Amino acid sequence: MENFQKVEKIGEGTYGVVYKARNKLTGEVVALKKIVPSTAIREISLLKELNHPNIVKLLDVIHTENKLYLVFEFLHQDLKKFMDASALTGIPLPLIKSYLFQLLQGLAFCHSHRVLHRDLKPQNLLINTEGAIKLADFGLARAFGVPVRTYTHEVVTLWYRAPEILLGCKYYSTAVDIWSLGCIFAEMVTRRALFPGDSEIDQLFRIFRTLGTPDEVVWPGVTSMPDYKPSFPKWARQDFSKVVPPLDEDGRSLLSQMLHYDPNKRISAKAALAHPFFQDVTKPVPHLRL
Numbered sequence: 001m002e003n004f005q006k007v008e009k010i011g012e013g014t015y016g017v018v019y020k021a022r023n024k025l026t027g028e029v030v031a032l033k034k035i036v037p038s039t040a041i042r043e044i045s046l047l048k049e050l051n052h053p054n055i056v057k058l059l060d061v062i063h064t065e066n067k068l069y070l071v072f073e074f075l076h077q078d079l080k081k082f083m084d085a086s087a088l089t090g091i092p093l094p095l096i097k098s099y100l101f102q103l104l105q106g107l108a109f110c111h112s113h114r115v116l117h118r119d120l121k122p123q124n125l126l127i128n129t130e131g132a133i134k135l136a137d138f139g140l141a142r143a144f145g146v147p148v149r150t151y152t153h154e155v156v157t158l159w160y161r162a163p164e165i166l167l168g169c170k171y172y173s174t175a176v177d178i179w180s181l182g183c184i185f186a187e188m189v190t191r192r193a194l195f196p197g198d199s200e201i202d203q204l205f206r207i208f209r210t211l212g213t214p215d216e217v218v219w220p221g222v223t224s225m226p227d228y229k230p231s232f233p234k235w236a237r238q239d240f241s242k243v244v245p246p247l248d249e250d251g252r253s254l255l256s257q258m259l260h261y262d263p264n265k266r267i268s269a270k271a272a273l274a275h276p277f278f279q280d281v282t283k284p285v286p287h288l289r290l
């Protein structure tokens with residue numbers, strides 16, 4: 001770590017503080033994350049080769065004095081801040097579309113190598129002045145786990161958690177990331193979180209009130225899941241036209257396939273890239289005030 005000069009704190013991550021830092025040598029400006037079982041070291045080390053333009057580059061892993069530091073490529077803004085900033089007018093549809101398209105490419109890449117994110121959320125979607133958006137923290141969950149609270153005691157958000165995780169499926173799939181991204185897509189369009197649960201049951205019930213309480217018809221095997229209870233209330237499903245106005249039919253159709261209950265039926269990232277919603281996709285430049 002003596003090779004880096006911290007510039008400022010840029011975030012409170014799941015596993016530790018995240019700093020903007022300068023490589024005291026090359027002058028490189030980076031993001032430095034403070035986070036060791038050998039399995040974690042091997043898993044993380046593998047992420048160094050998982051490179052794609054829509055994944056924040058993992059530059060190096062530093063293990064010293066039994067402390068772990070991850071050095072990443074630096075980006076100037078995150079999607080949470082960008083969305084807050086664009087609240088008054090909303091993010092233009094062509095930009096939301098470009099972002100979704102790019103994020104789907106990042107997921108398709110990671111998923112092809114059998115790597116899951118498992119904790120996608122606006123805070124870990126990073127943007128630059130060129131119109132790019134990238135996923136940060138891919139693979140860390142499998143390496144370190146996903147805590148209930150952060151090292152700061154901050155509550156880890158449930159808002160984007162897939163229903164199979166909430167229902168106790170132990171061996172969830174790449175579909176969990178498609179669910180999260182669908183939640184984020186709806187939030188960009190409406191300017192409000194889709195399912196802002198504040199406990200596991202609130203999160204589940206918020207999903208059920210919008211998408212209908214799942215049953216054996218829409219999700220074969222659901223009633224057997226570890227945390228499923230026959231006493232869950234039976235709510236009816238709402239129309240997407242009410243949920244994400246005024247998203248067009250193509251967008252509502254895609255969102256519906258990203259939020260399918262049955263993870264087996266949920267659209268894959270690769271199939272989503274082929275959806276008609278992306279027929280007119282472009283890459284606009286966002287207006288960034290740094």
Ligand SMILES: Brc1cnn2c(NCc3ccncc3)cc(-c3ccccc3)nc12
Nearest residue numbers: 010011012013018031072074075076077078
């Ligand atoms: Br890797 C990583 C690379 N950049 N980066 C950024 N950049 C955005 C930013 C935010 C504030 N000041 C300057 C740049 C934020 C976070 C982050 C980590 C945890 C929580 C929130 C954001 N992680 C990262």
